[PDB]
Design a protein around this ligand. Structure first.
Ligand SMILES: [Zn+2]
Ligand SMILES: [Zn+2]
Ligand SMILES: [Zn+2]
Lengths: 114, 266, 46, 65, 48
């Protein structure tokens, strides 16, 4: 009876806006971002994507506690490159790759008879 | 294409086997996991057992009802109940099923999924016919009736995803693999006498050349070229399963993007 | 029909006020069941 | 009791295969290894689910009321 | 007048009234048995 209702593993709350930026203090040009109602699904994806970027100096994430559908993500870019920008570019690249995959698989799927 | 290439090895009524190449491991795995977990569909969700005299407890039966795959191809025309303003359900957010059974026979009367009958108006949406993979034509065996036992109830089917409850999964366990030759050395083989003999080499080992032992371990290399196989429970055509998994993942990422827009907004 | 009690043994029907407490009139049993309600109980498919 | 639907781990529907499984056993005399493999239960997460089921609902069905 | 001597069910639990049996005692006292049904799903702390 202390079980949290499972629908809040994907449902933004009240003021639980999907994101919550926080400027890091330990290092310059770095930021820490919190996602609500998320998990490795999105995290590890975006994280590796960032890692692809050349101007990103640091990128890692963590799910603090499995009872909770959050994960913090910490970016750190070189100077003259806002973190939120690196995030935007990572999302865009991911979306383009997904779109390509979608069409390509749809194609090769039509390649069948069943 | 410029990103991933898909090469379908084989496609069936319920499975696609395909090579996923020129991708990153994380993207593959995320795709894997979303297909398992986050692609929405339709399932029984509330049962009004108006009468029951079987030997099964109601909640037992209602449980089995939950698990019955339903035709959910165009689920998108349906609305999450938490979004429909109607008092708990309507035809924009639900499908009403019903069930009556009676042990008219002297022998045992089986009760199959196919006995379910849609009541609510589908509005011409290819939704909710219980999936019948059975060759004999009657779907899941719901319950058995002896003689006088009568079972009569109505159900509500609703859009949901596997995160809330596994019954919504079109999942049907997904296979996954890469570097069958362990060239990446991502794993190390426990063995008593020889790793080579004691480990049955995977069937995918052929699609890549055996490592030439006279080569230094390449550290530059990274894992692409994943061999995946997706089995579909049947509530959705397999190709539709993978396509919608891709699309759902894309949607949620786009949502992140939009949230960034709101932040930079104010 | 609408119902008030069931004989346990005969498995038929019955009705009674605060009168007797026994006697499936046919079998004259001494144990009766309480004739399941009609409230159309609600259930959660999970 | 009655067959479970949906092999617990795997998720694959199995609630329909029960009848055919029994049929194979009786009428085809088949060996349940091959019987399962005939129904398509490849991985043992489902083979377990069927092979080891116990159908008590029979013995429930024998109390008259 | 007359005071209540009811029998509430256990404060912790909940469930469905399963089958209610009414009969007379050995000695002729009307007396009643009630059975409550409940499903228990494995939880974080249950033992196996
Ligand atoms: Zn509605
Ligand atoms: Zn009687
Ligand atoms: Zn399985």
């Amino acid at each position: 009876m202390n079980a949290p209702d499972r629908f809040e593993l994907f449902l933004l709350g009240e003021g639980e806006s999907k994101l919550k930026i926080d400027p890091d203090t330990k290092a310059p040009n770095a930021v820490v971002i919190t996602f609500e109602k998320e998990d490795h699904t999105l995290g590890n994806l975006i994280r590796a994507e960032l890692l692809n970027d050349r101007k990103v100096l640091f990128a890692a994430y963590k799910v603090e506690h499995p009872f909770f559908a959050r994960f913090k993500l910490r970016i750190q870019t070189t100077e003259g490159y806002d973190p939120k920008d690196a995030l935007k570019n990572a999302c865009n690249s991911i979306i383009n790759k997904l779109g390509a995959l979608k069409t390509n698989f749809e194609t090769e799927w039509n390649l069948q008879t069943l | 294409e410029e990103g991933p290439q898909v090469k379908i090895r084989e496609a069936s009524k319920d499975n696609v086997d395909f090579i996923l190449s020129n991708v990153d491991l994380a993207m593959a795995n995320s795709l894997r996991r979303v297909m398992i977990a986050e692609i929405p569909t339709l399932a029984i969700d509330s049962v009004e057992v108006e009468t029951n005299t079987t030997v099964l407890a109601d909640e037992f039966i209602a449980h089995r009802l939950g698990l019955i795959p339903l035709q959910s191809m165009d689920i998108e025309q349906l609305e999450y109940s938490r979004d429909c303003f109607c008092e708990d359900h309507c035809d924009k957010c639900s499908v009403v099923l019903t069930l009556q059974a009676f042990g008219e026979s002297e022998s045992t009367t089986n009760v199959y999924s196919k006995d379910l009958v849609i009541v609510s108006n589908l509005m011409g949406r290819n939704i909710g016919h219980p999936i019948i993979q059975d060759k004999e034509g009657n779907g899941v065996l719901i319950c058995k009736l002896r003689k006088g036992q009568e079972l009569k109830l109505t159900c509500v089917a609703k859009k949901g995803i596997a995160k809330e409850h596994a019954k919504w999964g079109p999942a049907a366990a997904i296979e996954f693999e890469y570097d069958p030759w362990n060239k990446l050395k991502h794993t190390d083989y426990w063995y008593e006498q020889d790793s080579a003999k004691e480990w049955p080499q995977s069937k995918n080992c052929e699609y890549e050349d055996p490592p030439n032992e006279g080569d230094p371990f390449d550290y530059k290399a990274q894992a692409d070229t994943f061999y995946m196989n997706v089995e579909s429970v049947g509530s959705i055509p397999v190709d539709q399963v993978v396509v919608r998994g891709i699309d759902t993942l894309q949607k949620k990422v786009a949502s992140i993007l939009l949230a960034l827009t709101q932040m930079d907004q104010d | 029909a609408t119902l008030k009690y069931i004989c346990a043994e005969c498995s038929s029907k019955l009705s009674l006020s605060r009168t007797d407490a026994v006697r499936c009139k046919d079998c004259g049993h001494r144990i009766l069941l309480k004739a399941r309600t009609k409230r159309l109980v609600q259930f959660e498919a999970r | 009791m009655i067959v479970p639907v949906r092999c617990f781990s795997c998720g694959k529907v199995v609630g329909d295969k029960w009848e055919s499984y029994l049929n194979l056993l009786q009428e085809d005399e088949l060996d349940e290894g091959t019987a399962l493999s005939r129904l398509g239960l490849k991985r043992y997460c489902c083979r377990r689910m069927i092979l080891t089921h116990v159908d008590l609902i029979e013995k429930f069905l024998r109390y008259n009321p | 007048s007359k005071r209540d001597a009811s029998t509430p069910l256990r404060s912790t639990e909940n469930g469905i009234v399963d089958q209610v049996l009414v009969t007379t005692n050995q000695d002729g006292l009307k007396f009643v048995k009630v059975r409550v049904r409940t499903t228990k799903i494995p939880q974080i702390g249950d033992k196996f």
